[PDB]
Enzyme design. Structure first.
Site, PDB file in Angstrom:
ATOM      1  CG  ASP A 159      -2.196   0.630   1.020  1.00 57.54           C
ATOM      2  OD1 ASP A 159      -2.379   1.130  -0.111  1.00 57.54           O
ATOM      3  OD2 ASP A 159      -3.015   0.672   1.961  1.00 57.54           O
ATOM      4  CD  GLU A 393      -2.788  -7.970   3.756  1.00 60.57           C
ATOM      5  OE1 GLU A 393      -2.438  -7.363   2.716  1.00 60.57           O
ATOM      6  OE2 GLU A 393      -3.854  -7.731   4.346  1.00 60.57           O
ATOM      7  CE1 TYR A 446      -8.860  -3.070   6.422  1.00 61.19           C
ATOM      8  CE2 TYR A 446      -7.703  -5.019   5.660  1.00 61.19           C
ATOM      9  CZ  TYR A 446      -7.697  -3.790   6.268  1.00 61.19           C
ATOM     10  OH  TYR A 446      -6.519  -3.282   6.739  1.00 61.19           O
ATOM     11  CD  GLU A 482      -3.493  -4.626   8.036  1.00 61.63           C
ATOM     12  OE1 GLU A 482      -4.196  -4.382   7.025  1.00 61.63           O
ATOM     13  OE2 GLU A 482      -2.252  -4.776   7.995  1.00 61.63           O
TER      14      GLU A 482
END
Ligand SMILES: [Ca+2]
Ligand SMILES: [Ca+2]
Lengths: 569, 569
Positions: A159, A393, A446, A482
């Site tokens: 990111d 990840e 998420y 997260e």
């Protein structure tokens, strides 16, 4: 060897920060080919150190630069330093460094988030010297973070913005010529008494040494003349989450002196719990980033204090050094404030086949082990670090990733037997192939944002179902490392919508409801702490806006609901 | 004596910044009356230095604190400094300081924006020392800025937040015991030839000295063995606005060594022009502030570079240090970047009878001269400083202010016979009683904002008329030192309204039209450079919003129209 530099009667630090002269390559490796280091840099601008260079100027070419830039300044060796050992220390240079002293190369370093140094005792002159630093930002498949070049355009699948520069203090320091090289401290507790195992390395192991253990009022509680020993600290003041206590290993060796803070605290993982000093600990906090306005990833201690005040205000007790090691000043601050830390190496971006011989291969693997060794040597003595995270990840659905991460996990376990090991998941639970090597399962989920965006009523059942699957497949305690939602400060809507302040609060609420129904969850970490900058993209409104706080460290609406929850736990 | 500390073969600097311990008084003067300095501080928090303390915590009581707070850290004197002179320097302490070393008071200071130091050669121990600093923020009628206490509430009339703390670096430094104390440099030009007048003062004046003048490639261009001399620099590279050149006065004295950068440039005033090296200079720029997020008025060198990049981008050539001296780092940067500076003393807030025995009186006067002496001593040798500003918006319509400012202007003219003197006006031109004492008349005028808000068509006629009156009354060239309009970023409207981005642009345009019709105008300084924090008030939307840039240093719409005008000027 990487003891944090200190000032005392025997050792002295000279800070080399301030304003340097700066120039970027106009073609790939221009500065090396034209041997710019051989003479003072010409046609330069001012650049502050420590700081990223990307956000300082009004020039888009420098902001988006791919390749190498050149820093230079002058420093002085005092007459009074005549017969001392001299060391040039870089807290970090992101990502690649070539260091020159008076026009001659003296060291190199690969990796943007860990310190390195060079003994310049016999190369620096009395008086003025010229220090030149080449800074490269190119990431390849054997760097951490992972990336690759296409034709020059930098590609990567993490990111955050690929800031580059000299992000941490530069220090010239001096010690006596016979000196303390390294220290390792481990602690155990038998009922009410603590046992401090230490090993000290010097460059003259036959010479006399004197080792004190001092308490926080600096009174001696243990004494020894051994380089390696095991001393009892009766009625030990334990280091606790929210109430730090730090002893000091105070070492006198010839003319040398070094004082090392440390904490006495135990870690034990049970079925379903994470015990610190024998008491269950539930992680409440954030993954962070080294990021703020203007300076990019530059160390800013004022911002660091403000963030710890914010963490305290909101009821957090922990953070993860998301996706790379942080500055030691922050690790030291966590030691002193009693903040529990998950310490992570930059094995991020191994996702889109990734684990192939032409990409993430054995060359990547060997470097990954080296970074872990460098991280362990820097942070082994911090009581705040309770767990190592070795990756964020990865594409761990690939069969080839199994042997890769079995090797990484076994290496870190040999270096450190006391701390649990982890890594964060994004692949589906059915396809993951590495989490059995971990002591704790960490998942990035998420629901309500990347899955079922806007569908508030689907968040709770989706997360609870996924949580149970992870517990049932591996049987270990789980942290959600997260979760969250992008949120534009000032965007309000009734009924709520994604990007609104109200939606972020509800999304987090519904995820929290799933976790509260699961007796095996030992932590919740919201993503993110503060808005931060990302590589440009149509899903990123001037960066990642998942912050609970803005980039200027002010709360959005959800911060107040999180505070109510975390403070009553 | 206030030479800026330097590192070389003979002198060394130890920075004492980082993270200190901190605690506020719970009642007025509590730490003094409980004698907190006698033992290490108890019940403390962390506070970064340099920084204001007000915006660091989540605690309103600290943000709004009235009175004193307490800072403490430890520092070391190395064995290697055994026979040196040891000096503790504070770049500034805002506003009032009492310094304690190992529990004994060693100095005090009144004034929050100028440095002070203490010789600690005889009192500091080798090894560890304890430094304790009481920091007071109360302003009274004989302080600068001016304020007063009512019943405990702080009152004042200036428009910026009364930040307090240790805003500038703390330095422990060493020199030889016989050493260079003060240096003054004045320059004249004769066609292509510079004459450098210098005067060096030392600790032992009968000993021998060696003085070199070096160019920017470090080459000697003049030389002397006198303490006081004029030496010629043929084909001298002049210090020019936007193209700086700095020579170095390189001084050797016994074991001591000091290098002073300086610039060769001349200043001259005609009744319509401001001449620098014989060429007319038109001021284009801003009054600034020392202000940013989180750290209040703390020095931030990365922020300074970004500001100078933005000044260059917008075509500005100058700034004024509203309303107090800035950090020396910023003055050095202006020296190196070729930025012209109006250097201002914190004589602000003498407004609402102000000049009365009970308010601004002979004590304020004597202190005002003292701060001018201190400012001159620090900044005398900066080529970037072309004019002293002795006040900002005093209530100079009172007859009593006439004698006050005649005294002040006489005094600064005695210190510095070459630089012009000024002070900024807000009273009506028909009422003013002091500007006849200045070399340049500076006016703060907000037509379209404080007068005739929203009436765009009345701005140009209003300012032109007022400008002509000021010129008719005093016959001196005029700088408009403040003008502009509060502007919320993202507020747009058609037709435009006050607070909108479009109005700010039009308001500045119409004011600029009036200045373009007045041949006696030598400068235009927009207020403000960047949004900054104010004491709370119903006209202040989270501070002053007249910034051309946001507090995070990004441009509003009006920045691009200003740039077009200034870059083609
Ligand atoms: Ca560091
Ligand atoms: Ca300073």
């Amino acid at each position: 060897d990487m003891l944090f530099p200190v000032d005392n009667e025997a050792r002295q630090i000279k800070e080399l920060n301030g304003i340097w002269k700066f120039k970027r390559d106009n073609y790939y490796k221009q500065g090396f080919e034209e041997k710019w280091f051989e003479k003072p840099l010409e046609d330069v601008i001012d650049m502050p150190v420590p700081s990223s260079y990307n956000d300082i100027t009004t020039d888009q070419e420098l902001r988006d630069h791919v390749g190498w830039v050149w820093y230079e300044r002058k420093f002085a060796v005092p007459r009074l330093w005549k017969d001392q050992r001299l060391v040039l220390r870089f807290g970090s240079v992101t990502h690649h460094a070539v260091i020159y002293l008076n026009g001659k190369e003296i060291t190199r370093h690969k990796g943007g988030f860990l310190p390195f140094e060079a003994d310049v005792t016999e190369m620096a002159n009395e008086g003025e010297n010229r220090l030149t630093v080449a800074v490269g930002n190119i990431l390849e498949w054997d760097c951490l973070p992972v990336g690759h070049i296409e034709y020059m355009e930098q590609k990567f699948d993490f990111d955050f913005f690929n800031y580059s520069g000299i992000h941490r203090p530069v220090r010239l320091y001096c010690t006596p010529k016979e000196y303390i090289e390294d220290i390792s401290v481990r602690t155990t507790v038998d009922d009410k008494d603590g046992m401090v195992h230490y090993e000290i390395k010097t460059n003259a192991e036959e010479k006399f040494i004197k080792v004190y253990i001092r308490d926080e009022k600096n009174q001696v509680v243990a004494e020894s003349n051994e380089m390696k020993d095991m001393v009892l600290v009766k009625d030990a003041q334990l280091w606790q989450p929210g109430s730090a206590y730090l002893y000091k290993l105070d070492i006198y060796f010839g003319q040398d002196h070094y004082t090392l803070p440390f904490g006495i605290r135990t870690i034990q993982l049970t079925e379903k719990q994470f015990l610190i000093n024998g008491k269950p600990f539930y992680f409440k906090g954030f993954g962070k980033h080294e990021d703020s306005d203007i300076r990019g990833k530059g160390l800013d201690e004022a911002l660091n204090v403000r963030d710890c005040e914010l963490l305290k205000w909101i009821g957090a007790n922990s953070f993860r050094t998301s996706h790379y090691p942080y500055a030691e000043e922050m690790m030291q601050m966590a030691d002193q404030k009693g903040i529990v830390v998950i310490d992570e190496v930059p094995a991020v971006g191994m996702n889109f086949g990734i684990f192939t011989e032409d990409k993430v291969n054995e060359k990547t693997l060997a470097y990954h082990k080296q970074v872990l060794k460098e991280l362990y040597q820097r942070d082994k003595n911090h009581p705040c670090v309770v767990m190592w995270s070795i990756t964020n990840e990865p594409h761990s659905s690939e069969e080839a990733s199994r042997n890769y991460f079995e090797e990484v996990t076994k290496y870190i376990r040999k270096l450190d037997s006391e701390r649990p090991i982890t890594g964060t998941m994004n692949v589906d639970v059915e396809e993951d192939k590495i989490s059995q090597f971990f002591d704790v399962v960490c998942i990035n989920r998420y629901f309500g944002w990347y899955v079922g965006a806007g569908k508030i009523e689907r968040i709770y059942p989706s997360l609870k179902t996924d949580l149970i699957k992870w517990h049932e497949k591996y049987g270990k305690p789980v942290i959600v490392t997260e979760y969250g939602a992008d949120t534009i400060a000032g965007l309000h809507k009734l009924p709520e919508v994604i990007f609104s302040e109200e939606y972020q609060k509800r999304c987090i609420e519904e995820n929290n409801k799933a976790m509260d129904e699961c007796d095996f969850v030992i932590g919740e970490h919201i993503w993110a702490f503060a808005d931060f900058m990302t590589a440009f993209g149509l899903k990123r409104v001037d960066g990642n806006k998942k912050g609970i706080f803005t980039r200027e460290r002010q709360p959005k609406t959800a911060a107040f609901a999180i505070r109510e929850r975390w403070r009553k736990m």
